[PDB]
Amino acid sequence: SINQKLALVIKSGKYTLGYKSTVKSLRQGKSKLIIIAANTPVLRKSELEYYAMLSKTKVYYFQGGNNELGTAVGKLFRVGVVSILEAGDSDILTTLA
Amino acid sequence: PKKRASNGRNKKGRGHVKPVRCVNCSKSIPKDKAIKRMAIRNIVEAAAVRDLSEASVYPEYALPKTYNKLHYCVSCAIHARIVRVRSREDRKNRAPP
Amino acid sequence: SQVFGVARIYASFNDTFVHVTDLSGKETIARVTGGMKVKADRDESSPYAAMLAAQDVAAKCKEVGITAVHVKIRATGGTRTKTPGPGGQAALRALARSGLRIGRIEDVTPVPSDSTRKKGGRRGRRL
Amino acid sequence: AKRTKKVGITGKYGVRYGSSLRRQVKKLEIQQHARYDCSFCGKKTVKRGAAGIWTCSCCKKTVAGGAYTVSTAAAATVRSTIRRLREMVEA
Amino acid sequence: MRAKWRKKRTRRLKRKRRKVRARSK
Amino acid sequence: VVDPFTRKEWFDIKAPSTFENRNVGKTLVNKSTGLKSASDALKGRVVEVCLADLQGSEDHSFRKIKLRVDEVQGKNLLTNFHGMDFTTDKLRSMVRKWQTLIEANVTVKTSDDYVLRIFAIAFTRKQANQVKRHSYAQSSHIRAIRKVISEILTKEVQGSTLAQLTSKLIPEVINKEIENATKDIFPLQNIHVRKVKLLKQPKFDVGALMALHG
Amino acid sequence: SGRGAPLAKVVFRDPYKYRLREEIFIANEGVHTGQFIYAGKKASLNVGNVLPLGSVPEGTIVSNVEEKPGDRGALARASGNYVIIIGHNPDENKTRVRLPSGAKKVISSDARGVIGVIAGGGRVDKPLLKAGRAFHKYRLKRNSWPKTRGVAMNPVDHPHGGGNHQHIGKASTISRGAVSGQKAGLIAARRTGLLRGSQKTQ
RNA sequence: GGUGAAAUUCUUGGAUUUAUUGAAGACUAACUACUGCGAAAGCAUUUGCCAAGGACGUUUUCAUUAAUCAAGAACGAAAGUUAGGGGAUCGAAGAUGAUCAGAUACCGUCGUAGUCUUAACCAUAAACUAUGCCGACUAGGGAUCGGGUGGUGUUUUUUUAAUGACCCACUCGGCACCUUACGAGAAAUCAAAGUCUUUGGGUUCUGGGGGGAGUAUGGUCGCAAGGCUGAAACUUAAAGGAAUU
Ligand SMILES: [Mg+2]
Ligand SMILES: [Mg+2]
Ligand SMILES: [Mg+2]
Ligand SMILES: [Mg+2]
Ligand SMILES: [Mg+2]
Ligand SMILES: [Mg+2]
Ligand SMILES: [Mg+2]
Ligand SMILES: [Mg+2]
Ligand SMILES: [Mg+2]
Ligand SMILES: [Mg+2]
Ligand SMILES: [Mg+2]
Ligand SMILES: [Mg+2]
Ligand SMILES: [Mg+2]
Ligand SMILES: [Mg+2]
Ligand SMILES: [Mg+2]
Ligand SMILES: [Mg+2]
Ligand SMILES: [Mg+2]
Ligand SMILES: [Mg+2]
Ligand SMILES: [Mg+2]
Ligand SMILES: [Mg+2]
Ligand SMILES: [Mg+2]
Ligand SMILES: [Mg+2]
Ligand SMILES: [Mg+2]
Ligand SMILES: [Mg+2]
Ligand SMILES: [Mg+2]
Ligand SMILES: [Mg+2]
Ligand SMILES: [Zn+2]
Ligand SMILES: [Zn+2]
Incomplete structure (x- = not known):
């Protein structure tokens, strides 16, 4: 699954959670993929999406609220966006995503 | 005392089967216990067959019958239809004829 | 060769219904039924009754123009006996025997994917 | 330390009005004080005040809803019906 | 008398002695 | 002292193109009296004629067809397609005990945007050396056959304007494509489409209706 | 105030x-x-x-619908109510709806409605429990509470007043053709008594 | 129209019928069987999603972790109860038409609750195989469901395979039937109800003549109806089972 690979990336690669840091990660060209929660307000989605393409970073719209994405990254708090800084032995960077 | 190893009809390993409504009196009766007969009989009868292909287009053309099942409610199945009674050891025999 | 029509015999018990309509249905002709040719209220379906009403039936059937007709025999159906009444086998006979023609008849007894609990309670009509 | 065996919030009414009236109230009363999940921001901070009006502690969004609960059953079916008929008029 | 009708019999009979005894609780 | 027989007008029914004969029969309506005349109020009817009478041979004894009547001109009311059924007896005669039944169906459109739902029935068959008396399938056979039947049926429809689907059904093309893909799963004697109903049709388009006429 | 349902302030551009x-x-x-x-x-x-x-398919659920086009909204405004579209007559461009009372009106297709139901639904499910809750309720609508029964008044006061026990004295089903000072009771009542059987018009 | 036969009823309101079409709720017909599955209740239209399971295959793993169980607990047909929805059907109640000496019924008409569903209760059925669970052993037969193994078996042709279904032998584990019976029983019957006066594998539960009576009383659970627990005084020579005539 898409969770299945996120769960790998969590356990073998590098990442960062939250909005301020993915932008620090977008500005430094570090993010290879950002994952946006369904209920994240559009304006933030827009701004991330804009910051994305300026970085030529790909964007996956996680079909799901922030409460769920926090679960998917294996965290007990809610997360609105994620930034894959290095994918581990997972292939999200180079699969149908 | 008991007077049938089947207690009635055809149910071992199940526990409950849906009932059917008798075709004569409409009494409910479990389908496993409900004396059944397929009704196959022509539309035309012993005499109307000759009168049929006489004043008819399409030489004899099909003679198609009507087919339906019947469900009896032992009370009814005994009143008219196929049991009437069997003796003690006549009871056992399940040969149709 | 001839001029077609639909018969659609509904021969339940306690009455029998023979009436011809256009091969399309929306236009009907010549209905008179089995409770119309006797007055006994227990002979309202007997073959001897549906016969006499088959005679009046084919009469207008030719007095209007149908020389041939297909039949669609039918019982009560629905949640009922599903089985043909007695005055159907008389009627089909006494309408082909009236010099009418017969082609490709079938059965149109309504038969459901069982539902709509029958009348008369789980213990049956006990008499 | 379990304080009441069945009255719960409804204990404020003491003995008055009759058990079956207080049961009916207690239900809608529990319905109508409770903290609900914000469909918009995620956190569970939709509270009520003025039946019909439900607003979120932070993100301060206000949703019209049921008199003592956020989504009334009917409204929710009406949603899916409106969904149903809308998609009927895109394809 | 049918066993079950004797069940209903004493069911009522209890509900009446149940009732009558309450005049005095 | 009325006898509307002295009053009603007559009419003769003509079938569409893709059959053998087009001359069907007669009908009674009314005098074309202004303010509810014999045209607009009716003739939007159907007729149930067995296609073995609409084609001629008796390898078509089952398979009733409904002909809806859509346009009228000068004692001549051409008809179009409205549905197809089976004779009650045929079905009643295919369903025998000791064998598995299998039914499937799908709602689907066409280029000529006639939405419809076709059906499909099929019964198991005994291998012609088989000793065990009943020969049932495996309920995963059953689910697969429906998938393939549903695979095969969805392609025929939305294949161009049910008038061609008409030309597709009449020669039983579908029936074998079923059985061909099927033989890898289970024997399955007695495969037919067995039914199709019509539920939504597009705007009249007086032009395209006269495509099957002449 | 005095309303079951919330309002919605909705600003547009002129x-x-x-x-x-x-x-x-x-x-x-x-x-x-x-x-x-x-x-x-x-x-x-x-x-x-x-x-x-x-412009809405049948089965649609709209509130605050106008009875004539442009009257800015008459039907189905109380908390929880709505009307259901149940068919269109495109020529004459009417539309048939079913109001909350069950009655089925047929108004212009240009009559406007708002898609959904009115908020605050289910408010009447909760018991008032006591006079004061009722008090504050009517305190904000109109001086219609509490209600003395005509049957506990003197005859000057009511058709039902007087007698040495409290009793209505004559049929309390008053006719349409009655006159002011007469219409108290069950006006025009075509049936009366506990409604056995299911309600809900065909 | 309905019935043994009738009648209460429905019919200028075009009934009943016919035709085209629409809406509502319920059900899943034929296929359905000495067929499958689940702890039991119970489970039968398609498709997607969600977790679950037995049997089997096994030169995998752990290594006594298990058997059966007072207390306690999960589930628990139908009806019935609370609050919403729903309310096609059939239909306790009630009202009728008949029948009857009577007829509070059987039969016919109407038809309230109900019947379906959501949230909650209720915990009982001839809830039946009237037959506790685990283990061992004791005797023949042919069908069948699932799994597996064996194949110069049949059938599908394409060019032969592979496949799939089919056939034959065997082996696990199912639901059942047949025939015998060493054996068992009061018998009817019974591969367990056998391996008991030649009386002992482990374990749980219940019964001790018939009424009184599942009543009285207390305790407890329940909104209620009622569930569980449950006496006695007194009375009585039978009550009962299976088979024969
Ligand atoms: Mg006996
Ligand atoms: Mg049974
Ligand atoms: Mg049972
Ligand atoms: Mg009735
Ligand atoms: Mg009898
Ligand atoms: Mg007192
Ligand atoms: Mg005042
Ligand atoms: Mg007052
Ligand atoms: Mg008052
Ligand atoms: Mg006074
Ligand atoms: Mg007065
Ligand atoms: Mg006065
Ligand atoms: Mg007075
Ligand atoms: Mg008074
Ligand atoms: Mg089915
Ligand atoms: Mg204790
Ligand atoms: Mg009802
Ligand atoms: Mg009565
Ligand atoms: Mg009487
Ligand atoms: Mg009574
Ligand atoms: Mg018990
Ligand atoms: Mg039993
Ligand atoms: Mg046994
Ligand atoms: Mg093999
Ligand atoms: Mg054996
Ligand atoms: Mg208590
Ligand atoms: Zn019967
Ligand atoms: Zn919020």
Whole structure:
């Protein structure tokens, strides 16, 4: 699954959670993929999406609220966006995503 | 005392089967216990067959019958239809004829 | 060769219904039924009754123009006996025997994917 | 330390009005004080005040809803019906 | 008398002695 | 002292193109009296004629067809397609005990945007050396056959304007494509489409209706 | 105040002058602050929008519907109510709806409604429990509470007044043709008594 | 129209019928069987999603972790109860038409609750195989469901395979039937109800003549109806089972 690979990336690669840091990660060209929660307000989605393409970073719209994405990254708090800084032995960077 | 190893009809390993409504009196009766007969009989009868292909287009053309099942409610199945009674050891025999 | 029509015999018990309509249905002709040719209220379906009403039936059937007709025999159906009444086998006979023609008849007894609990309670009509 | 065996919030009414009236109230009363999940921001901070009006502690969004609960059953079916008929008029 | 009708019999009979005894609780 | 027989007008029914004969029969309506005349109020009817009478041979004894009547001109009311059924007896005669039944169906459109739902029935068959008396399938056979039947049926429809689907059904093309893909799963004697109903049709388009006429 | 349902303040632009123009809607359950509302013939079919009953498929559920086009909304305004579109007659462009009372009216297809139900539903399920709750209720509507029964008044006061026990004295079903000072009781009552059987008009 | 036969009823309101079409709720017909599955209740239209399971295959793993169980607990047909929805059907109640000496019924008409569903209760059925669970052993037969193994078996042709279904032998584990019976029983019957006066594998539960009576009383659970627990005084020579005539 898409969770299945996120769960790998969590356990073998590098990442960062939250909005301020993915932008620090977008500005430094570090993010290879950002994952946006369904209920994240559009304006933030827009701004991330804009910051994305300026970085030529790909964007996956996680079909799901922030409460769920926090679960998917294996965290007990809610997360609105994620930034894959290095994918581990997972292939999200180079699969149908 | 008991007077049938089947207690009635055809149910071992199940526990409950849906009932059917008798075709004569409409009494409910479990389908496993409900004396059944397929009704196959022509539309035309012993005499109307000759009168049929006489004043008819399409030489004899099909003679198609009507087919339906019947469900009896032992009370009814005994009143008219196929049991009437069997003796003690006549009871056992399940040969149709 | 001839001029077609639909018969659609509904021969339940306690009455029998023979009436011809256009091969399309929306236009009907010549209905008179089995409770119309006797007055006994227990002979309202007997073959001897549906016969006499088959005679009046084919009469207008030719007095209007149908020389041939297909039949669609039918019982009560629905949640009922599903089985043909007695005055159907008389009627089909006494309408082909009236010099009418017969082609490709079938059965149109309504038969459901069982539902709509029958009348008369789980213990049956006990008499 | 379990304080009441069945009255719960409804204990404020003491003995008055009759058990079956207080049961009916207690239900809608529990319905109508409770903290609900914000469909918009995620956190569970939709509270009520003025039946019909439900607003979120932070993100301060206000949703019209049921008199003592956020989504009334009917409204929710009406949603899916409106969904149903809308998609009927895109394809 | 049918066993079950004797069940209903004493069911009522209890509900009446149940009732009558309450005049005095 | 009325006898509307002295009053009603007559009419003769003509079938569409893709059959053998087009001359069907007669009908009674009314005098074309202004303010509810014999045209607009009716003739939007159907007729149930067995296609073995609409084609001629008796390898078509089952398979009733409904002909809806859509346009009228000068004692001549051409008809179009409205549905197809089976004779009650045929079905009643295919369903025998000791064998598995299998039914499937799908709602689907066409280029000529006639939405419809076709059906499909099929019964198991005994291998012609088989000793065990009943020969049932495996309920995963059953689910697969429906998938393939549903695979095969969805392609025929939305294949161009049910008038061609008409030309597709009449020669039983579908029936074998079923059985061909099927033989890898289970024997399955007695495969037919067995039914199709019509539920939504597009705007009249007086032009395209006269495509099957002449 | 004195209303079952919440209102919805919805500002539009004045197409003809540079200014904002605030309208007061009845909040349809599910609408929310910051939402965009779309009002027009060629508008889409979401909860909140306002659309002419002709432009909606049957089965649609609309509130605050006008009885004549443009009267700015008469039917189905109380908390929890709505009307259901149940067919169109495109020529004459009527639309048949079923009001909350069950009665089925047929109004113009240009009559407008707002997609959904009115908010605050189910308010009447909760017992008032006591005089004061009723008091504050009517304190904000009209001086209609509490109600003395005509049967505990003296005859000067009511058709039902007087007698040495409390009793109505004559049939309490009064006729339409009655006159002021006579109509108290069950006016025009065509049946009376406990309603056995199921309600809900065919 | 309905019935043994009738009648209460429906019919200028075009009934009943016919035709085209629409809406509502319920059900899943034929296929359905000495067929499958689940702890039991119970489970039968398609498709997607969600977790679950037995049997089997096994030169995998752990290594006594298990058997059966007072207390306690999960589930628990139908009806019935609370609050919403639903309310097609059939239909306790009630009202009728008949029948009857009577007829509070059987039969016919109407038809309230109900019947379906959501949230909650209720915990009982001839809830039946009237037959506790685990283990061992004791005797023949042919069908069948699932799994597996064996194949110069049949059938599908394409060019032969592979496949799939089919056939034959065997082996696990199912639901059942047949025939015998060493054996068992008061018998009817019974591969367990056998391997008991030649009386002992482990374990749980219940009964001790018939009424009184599942009543009285207390305790407890329940909104209620009622569930569980449950006496006695007194009375009585039978009550009962299976088979024969
Ligand atoms: Mg006996
Ligand atoms: Mg049974
Ligand atoms: Mg049972
Ligand atoms: Mg009735
Ligand atoms: Mg009898
Ligand atoms: Mg007192
Ligand atoms: Mg006042
Ligand atoms: Mg007062
Ligand atoms: Mg008052
Ligand atoms: Mg006074
Ligand atoms: Mg007066
Ligand atoms: Mg006065
Ligand atoms: Mg007075
Ligand atoms: Mg008084
Ligand atoms: Mg089915
Ligand atoms: Mg204790
Ligand atoms: Mg009802
Ligand atoms: Mg009565
Ligand atoms: Mg009487
Ligand atoms: Mg009575
Ligand atoms: Mg018990
Ligand atoms: Mg039993
Ligand atoms: Mg046994
Ligand atoms: Mg093999
Ligand atoms: Mg054996
Ligand atoms: Mg108590
Ligand atoms: Zn019967
Ligand atoms: Zn919020």
